[PDB]
Amino acid sequence: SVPSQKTYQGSYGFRLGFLHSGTAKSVTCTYSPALNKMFCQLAKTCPVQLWVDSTPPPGTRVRAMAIYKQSQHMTEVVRRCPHHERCSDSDGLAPPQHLIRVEGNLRVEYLDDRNTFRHSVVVPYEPPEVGSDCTTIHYNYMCYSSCMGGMNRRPILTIITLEDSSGNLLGRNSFEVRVCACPGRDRRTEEENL
Ligand SMILES: [Zn+2]
Numbered sequence: 695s696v697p698s699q700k701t702y703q704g705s706y707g708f709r710l711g712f713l714h715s716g717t718a719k720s721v722t723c724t725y726s727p728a729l730n731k732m733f734c735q736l737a738k739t740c741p742v743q744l745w746v747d748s749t750p751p752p753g754t755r756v757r758a759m760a761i762y763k764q765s766q767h768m769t770e771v772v773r774r775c776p777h778h779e780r781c782s783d784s785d786g787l788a789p790p791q792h793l794i795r796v797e798g799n800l801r802v803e804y805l806d807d808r809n810t811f812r813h814s815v816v817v818p819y820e821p822p823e824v825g826s827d828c829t830t831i832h833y834n835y836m837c838y839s840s841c842m843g844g845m846n847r848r849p850i851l852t853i854i855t856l857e858d859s860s861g862n863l864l865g866r867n868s869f870e871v872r873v874c875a876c877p878g879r880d881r882r883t884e885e886e887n888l
Contacts (some may be wrong), residue, residue, distance in 0.1 A: 695810055696768045697761060699853055699868050707747030708856050708865030711828055717878040724877045728888060731870040732852070733877035736838055737783065739797060742854065742869075743828040744819070753859030754819035758794050758833060759812060763849040763870060771811050774837045775844025783836065789813070793845075794852065797832040819856065835873045845873075 703709060712725035712732070723734040723741065734740045744756065760772040772793055773779075779790045788795040789804055792813045796802040805814045815833075822829050833852075837844045849870060856865035874880050 697759060697810075697812065697853060698866070699761065699851060700866065701868070702863070702866040704856060704863075704865035706750050706856070706865060707745075708867065709745040710854060710867045710869065711743035711745050712869075713741055713743075717882040719876065719878050721878040724881050725869070726881050726885060728885060729870065731872065731881075731884070733872050733874060733881045734835060735875065735877060736873060737834050737836055740833040740835065741830050742833055743830050744854075744856075745828045749821050750819055750856060750864060751858075754864065755816050755857050755859070755861075756819050756831065757814050757816040757855045757857060758796075758831075759814040759853050759855075760793050760850045760871070761812075761853065762845075763851050767848050771813070772845065772850055773813065775841040775846075778837045778841065778844065788815070788836075793835060793837050793850075795834040795836055797834050799832075816857075835871065837873060838875075839871075839873045 715721050715724045722738045725732050762768050773791045774793055787802055794815050796815050796817055799817050801818055803816045820829055839845050840847055851868045852871050853868045
């Protein structure tokens with residue numbers, strides 16, 4: 695039982711975009727084109743851009759879910775470790791077990807799937823401004839990749855799906871994510887291997 699991670703631009707030409715933030719030590723969130731991999735700090739703003747060729751209709755929703763990248767771990771539900779789960783870092787909206795939160799959107803909705811037990815977070819799709827090319831969603835990852843009893847150094851993917859009001863799939867994309875203390879150094883380090 696594993697959610698699909700297959701790229702699907704769909705009829706609205708759905709793509710993801712990311713800020714070009716570089717690898718200086720001060721960066722809180724940085725994306726690697728070569729690795730298709732986001733490096734970000736704990737609970738910090740992670741901007742993920744939604745790019746479309748044509749505007750999805752009103753009622754369109756945007757969902758985010760994490761799964762383990764490695765096949766021998768893919769059936770295991772990605773959740774926070776007990777320490778962070780039990781931490782006093784609640785925004786009053788997100789369930790304490792959920793890795794992925796959305797910041798700055800009061801219409802955010804969280805799901806524990808009654809059948810697969812997987813966690814996800816969904817928001818209404820907003821079109822970009824007229825003078826803008828994309829819609830930005832501010833995600834927070836609430837556990838480190840290294841958390842013992844949590845992800846425990848196992849790599850994860852974030853899957854972003856576009857769905858209609860009735861939950862039908864409209865588009866899908868994904869990126870790898872590492873939650874760490876120094877995203878710039880870790881990104882630069884992982885890329886020197888190339
Ligand atoms: Zn943790």
